[PDB]
Design a protein around this motif. Structure first.
Motif, short mmCIF file in Angstrom:
data_model
loop_
_atom_site.label_atom_id
_atom_site.label_comp_id
_atom_site.label_asym_id
_atom_site.label_seq_id
_atom_site.Cartn_x
_atom_site.Cartn_y
_atom_site.Cartn_z
N UNK A 9 0.89 -1.34 0.03
CA UNK A 9 0.10 0.22 0.30
C UNK A 9 0.65 1.40 -0.08
N UNK A 10 0.40 2.86 -0.77
CA UNK A 10 1.73 3.68 -0.71
C UNK A 10 1.32 4.46 -0.11
N UNK B 192 3.72 -0.50 5.16
CA UNK B 192 3.77 -0.32 3.87
C UNK B 192 3.42 -1.80 3.46
N UNK B 193 3.81 -2.84 4.01
CA UNK B 193 3.78 -4.13 3.26
C UNK B 193 3.08 -5.06 4.06
N UNK B 194 2.43 -6.32 3.69
CA UNK B 194 1.69 -6.68 4.51
C UNK B 194 2.32 -8.53 4.10
#
Length: 98
Positions: free
Chosen positions: A55-56, A61-63
């Protein structure tokens, strides 16, 4: 059995309080979801589901999550996965130091 793998669990950059389960010397730096999947596959674990969301935006931010089935317990499975990833990366680099 069946359990979830979360990259933070085997990430040597992290503290135990922040999620690392695997012993420091076995853990690898920044394990990627794709690396964990390939390691699991090489170990003949069954990969049930892989989720990755980028996600920006900070630490969120990262999953990434991998649902696996292994003949072994989670702790041992994680250690084998970490060792396989280290082996992967070394093969690719073809060198020990930068």
């Amino acid at each position: 059995g069946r359990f979830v793998v979360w990259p933070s669990e085997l990430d040597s950059r992290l503290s135990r309080k922040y999620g690392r389960i695997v012993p420091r010397s076995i853990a690898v730096e920044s394990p990627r979801v794709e690396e964990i999947v390939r390691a699991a596959e090489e170990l003949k674990f069954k990969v049930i589901r892989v989720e990755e969301d980028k996600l920006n935006p900070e630490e969120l931010r990262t999953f990434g999550m991998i649902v696996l089935e292994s003949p072994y317990g989670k702790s041992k499975s994680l250690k084998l996965i970490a060792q396989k990833i280290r082996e992967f990366r070394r093969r690719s680099a073809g060198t020990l130091v930068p």
